[PDB]
Design a protein around this ligand. Structure first.
Ligand SMILES: COC(=O)N[C@H](C(=O)N[C@@H](Cc1ccccc1)[C@@H](O)CN(Cc1ccc(-c2ccccn2)cc1)NC(=O)[C@@H](NC(=O)OC)C(C)(C)C)C(C)(C)C
Lengths: 99, 99
């Protein structure tokens, strides 16, 4: 689809068979999800945004379906105020910026 | 142009007569540049992201040329980790997300 930018580019994603709303974010290297208790091993990581760094849990090889397009990769879980889909998954679904 | 996301979508901008590099950032409501001088009056503002809030200077009605496309809008200046072009200006240059 084409998503205009008049409002926040929030779309429905599926993770663990369950649905969430997340921001398609070209300004994000990584995918960062609101706290959720995923199973499996994780690694601690620190990621930085506008206000500084937060502690997140790094889960690898997590399937995430974005607006019907399938992806699989690293998902960071922690105290973010919004679910963010970053470039690591946006590339997998063939997302471009266009003007 | 069409811009893919295997790398950060960095572009050259022209502002206050100077060239800079900034990140096309669909996850940003606002446009935020590293500390610099801009002409005219500004207002103290706060903006928030991952990691928390920062103090910025709000400059209104500032012309900025983004890859040769013109915009005139609000530019925030402060201790952002990196220069970002947000939706307020991406909409002005006709930028959409496509997949
Ligand atoms: C309604 O609030 C916003 O729109 N907030 C925006 C904002 O923070 N947007 C975030 C996503 C977001 C939106 C709303 C609430 C919380 C988070 C991003 O669009 C822009 N931001 C811009 C940004 C970019 C880079 C960096 C950075 C950090 C460390 C080292 C180098 N760069 C910091 C901020 N990117 C990041 O923070 C990413 N950081 C990143 O990719 O780091 C490499 C994350 C996400 C992976 C953490 C601005 C403050 C930029 C206006």
């Amino acid at each position: 689809p084409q998503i205009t930018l008049w409002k926040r580019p929030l779309v429905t994603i599926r993770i663990g068979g369950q649905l969430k709303e997340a921001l398609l974010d070209t300004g994000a290297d990584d995918t960062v999800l609101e706290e959720m208790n995923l199973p499996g091993k994780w690694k601690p990581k620190m990621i930085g945004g506008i206000g500084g760094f937060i502690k997140v849990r790094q889960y690898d090889q997590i399937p995430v379906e974005i607006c019907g397009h399938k992806a699989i990769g690293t998902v960071l879980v922690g105290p973010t105020p919004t679910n963010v889909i970053g470039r690591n998954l946006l590339t997998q679904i063939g997302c471009t910026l266009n003007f």
